[PDB]
Amino acid sequence: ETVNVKEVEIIKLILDFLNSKKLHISMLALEKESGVINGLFSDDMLFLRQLILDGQWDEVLQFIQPLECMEKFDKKRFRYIILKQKFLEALCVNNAMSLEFTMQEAVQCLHALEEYCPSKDDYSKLCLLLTLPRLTNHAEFKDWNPSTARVHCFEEVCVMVAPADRKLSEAGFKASNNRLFQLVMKGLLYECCVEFCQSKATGEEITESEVLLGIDLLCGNGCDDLDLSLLSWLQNLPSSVFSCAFEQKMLNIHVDKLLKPT
Amino acid sequence: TVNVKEVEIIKLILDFLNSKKLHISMLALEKESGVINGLFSDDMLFLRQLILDGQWDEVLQFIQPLECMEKFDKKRFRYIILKQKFLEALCVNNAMLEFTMQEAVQCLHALEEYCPSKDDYSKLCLLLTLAEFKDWNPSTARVHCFEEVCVMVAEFIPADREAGFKASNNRLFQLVMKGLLYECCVEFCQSKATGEEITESEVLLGIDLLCGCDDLDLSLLSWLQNLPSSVFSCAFEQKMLNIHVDKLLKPTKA
C-alpha cells in the first residue's frame, strides 16, 4: 500500500509538455535550473547539444567532421541544416541592424550554403529572404525563433548522429509524447468515474454527459483526492461484469490553444 | 465532448514550479506564455511585474500614494524594498569597470532609517565583507517580496471580485497520480476479464510514470454506464495509502 514517485520524472513530463508547445526558452530555463534533461544522451551528445543551443556552429562543424567519410551519414543534409541556421541567424542580425559587416557575413553564409541546398528553388527562396527587411515577412519563416530553430536543429542532428550512449537500468527513460496531458486527462476521467459511482450509489443517476461537463481542471473537489476507493472497490466484486461487453464511444477533446505573445 | 484549455495546464505547471521553488523557470514560463497563476487586478499585476523585473524605485513611486494612509506600515515596506535592492546590488558587486560599492553603501544607508531593530542593521553591515544564509535567490527573493507586499497592499488595491482562476496547490501532482490510478484500474479490469490472477500490490507496483503505453479512451466509463446499478455499493477496505516522493537534486550554480 505504498507508491514511489520521483520529482525528476515529473519535471521530465513538464519538459516534454513545454517542448510540445514550443516553449523552448522555458524548457531550457527548467533544464538549467533543475539539472534534468528529458532523455539519456551520450557524454558527447550533451556537448553537441550545448554547442547547438549556444550557437557554436563552427565548433559543431569541426566536431562532426571526423564522421564525414562514413556510410549512411548524410553529410549533405547535416551541413545544409547547420549552414542554413547560421545563415538565418546572420540574416536576423542584419535585418535588425537597420550596415557594418553583418551583410557581408550573411552573404558569406549564403555562399557557403550555396552547395548543400537540396534544390536550386530553396536557394532562390533563401536569396530572396536576404532582400526582405525582415525574414519573418515570409509565410514559411513568419513564426521563427532562434531558440526553437536551434532545438529543431539539434533534434534533426541527433537522429542522424546516434553515435552511442551508456546503457543503464532505468536512467534511460524519456517522457512519452504528450504523457503529461494524457495523465491529466486520465486523472480527470478517474475523477469523473469516482463522481459517477458516488452519485449513482447516492441516488441520483445522471447521464454520462453530466459527469463529463462537470470536469474541473483547475480546482479539485477532492482535498485528499486519493482515497484508493476505486481499486479496492474493483477488488471485491463479482467477476462476471468484467466479461460484460460495453459501448466503444470515442473521447472528444477540444483544446483551447495558447495565445503566445510575439 | 469536453473543453480543455492549455492555459489551465500551464497554471498547473506554474503552481508545481512554485511549490518546488523553481522560480527562474516559473518566471520564464510566465513571460513566454503570457499566463499568470492567480487572480490579480490590473494594478496588482503591474506591481508584480515591477517587483519581478527588478524595478525598485518605480515600485516605491507606485506605492507612495498609499503611504499617507493611516492603517498602513510605511516602515516595513520601504525596509524590505530597499533591503532587496541592497542585496541585489551586493550580489551584482560580487562578480568576477567598478563603481558599484558606492551604490551598495547608498542602498545600505538608505534602509538604515527603516530597520525594526539596530542589531539587525548592524548584522546587515557585516555582509559587506563576504554567505551566512545562502538560500537567497533573486527570483525567489523577488517572489517573496511581492508576496509580502501583496499581503498588505491588497486592502487598498481590491481584487475586483473569486479565486476561480488559480491553479490550486499541487493539483498537477494529484491529477498525475489519479491518471496512474486510472491506468492501474484499467489494467486490473483487463486482467480479471481475460482470465488472469491479480492482486492489489502488483497493480500498484505496475505504475509507469514516464511510460505500459495504454492509449486514452473512456472505455471504463462506458463499462460503468453499461453495468447494473445493484453492485455500486459494496464493502471494501479503505487502504493505508502512502506516497514517498524522491525530492529534487537541486544543483548549485547561479
Binding site: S243, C244, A245, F246, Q248 | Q190, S191, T194, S219
Partner: peptide, 16 residues
C-alpha cells in the same frame, strides 16, 4: 459497436 475488456487486452498483447 461493441467492445470488451478481454478484446482490448488481446488487441494490446497482439501488437507488441
Amino acid at each position: 459497436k461493441m467492445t470488451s475488456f478481454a478484446e482490448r487486452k488481446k488487441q494490446l498483447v497482439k501488437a507488441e
